[PDB]
Design a protein around this ligand. Structure first.
Ligand SMILES: *[C@@H]1O[C@H](CO)[C@@H](O[C@@H]2O[C@H](CO)[C@@H](O)[C@H](O)[C@H]2NC(C)=O)[C@H](O)[C@H]1NC(C)=O
Ligand SMILES: *[C@@H]1O[C@H](CO)[C@@H](O[C@@H]2O[C@H](CO)[C@@H](O)[C@H](O)[C@H]2NC(C)=O)[C@H](O)[C@H]1NC(C)=O
Ligand code: NAG
Lengths: 109, 49
C-alpha cells in the first residue's frame, strides 16, 4: 500500500527474474485515464435531515444527482441504503436540496 | 499516480479523516474549529522557529 515503493501508480503484482549478479522485478501497475469533470456537493438534506455517503461521492451531470466511487465512474441512484443521516442541514456548508428515494414505500404498494 | 484531478479542500480533508477511522461527519460539523486550530498552530511554529 505504500506509495511509489514498487511501481508507479497503484500496485497489482510483481514477477522476479534472475540476472548475472542481481535481480530484476517486473511490476504491474494500474493507471486511470479518460477523465471527466462534474459538479459535487458535500451532503444532501431531505425532509430536514442531512445525508452523507458511505463509500463514494455525490456527482451531478447538470440536472440529476448520483453517488459514484472515487476511482471509477459508474453512477447509481441515491437511496437510503448507501447513505447515512446525521443531524440537520443548518451548519454544514455547501448543502444542496434534493430528494432521496426509498424502496420500502414502492415495494409495500 | 497519474494526471492531476482537482478536488475541493474540504472533501480532501474529509477523505483524510475517513482514512484514519474518524467518520467524515466530524469534519463537516467542526470545520471552523479545525481551521482556527490549524491557523494558531502554523502561527506558533513561526515564533518557535
Ligand atoms: C443527466 O443524467 C440523467 C440520467 O442519466 C439524464 O436523464 C435521462 O435523459 C435521457 C435522455 O433522453 C432520458 O431518456 C432518460 O429517461 C433520463 N433519465 C432520467 C432519470 O432523468 C439527463 O438527461 C442527463 N443530463 C444531461 C444534460 O444530459
Ligand atoms: C432548501 O429548502 C429550504 C426550505 O424549502 C430553503 O429554505 C428557505 O429558503 C428561502 C429562500 O431564501 C427562504 O426565504 C426561507 O426562509 C427558507 N426557509 C424556509 C423554512 O422556507 C432553502 O433555501 C433551500 N435551499 C436551496 C439551495 O434551494
Ligand atoms: C471541466 O470544466 C472545467 C471548467 O472550464 C475545465 O477547467 C476542465 O478542464 C474540464 N475538465 C476536463 C477534463 O477538461
Amino acid at each position: 500500500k505504500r506509495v511509489d515503493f514498487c511501481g508507479k501508480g497503484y500496485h497489482l503484482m510483481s514477477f522476479p527474474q534472475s540476472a548475472p549478479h542481481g535481480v530484476v522485478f517486473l511490476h504491474v501497475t494500474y493507471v486511470p485515464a479518460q477523465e471527466k469533470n462534474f459538479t459535487t456537493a458535500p451532503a444532501i438534506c431531505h425532509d430536514g435531515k442531512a445525508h452523507f455517503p458511505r463509500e463514494g461521492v455525490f456527482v451531478s451531470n447538470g440536472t440529476h444527482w448520483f453517488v459514484t466511487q472515487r476511482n471509477f465512474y459508474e453512477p447509481q441512484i441515491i437511496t437510503t441504503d448507501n447513505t447515512f443521516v446525521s443531524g440537520n442541514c443548518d451548519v454544514v456548508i455547501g448543502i444542496v436540496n434534493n430528494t432521496v428515494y426509498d424502496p420500502l414505500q414502492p415495494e409495500l404498494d | 499516480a497519474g494526471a492531476a484531478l482537482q478536488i475541493p479542500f474540504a472533501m480532501q480533508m474529509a477523505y483524510r479523516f475517513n482514512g484514519i477511522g474518524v467518520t467524515q461527519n466530524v469534519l463537516y460539523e467542526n470545520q471552523k474549529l479545525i481551521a482556527n486550530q490549524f491557523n494558531s498552530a502554523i502561527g506558533k511554529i513561526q515564533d518557535s522557529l
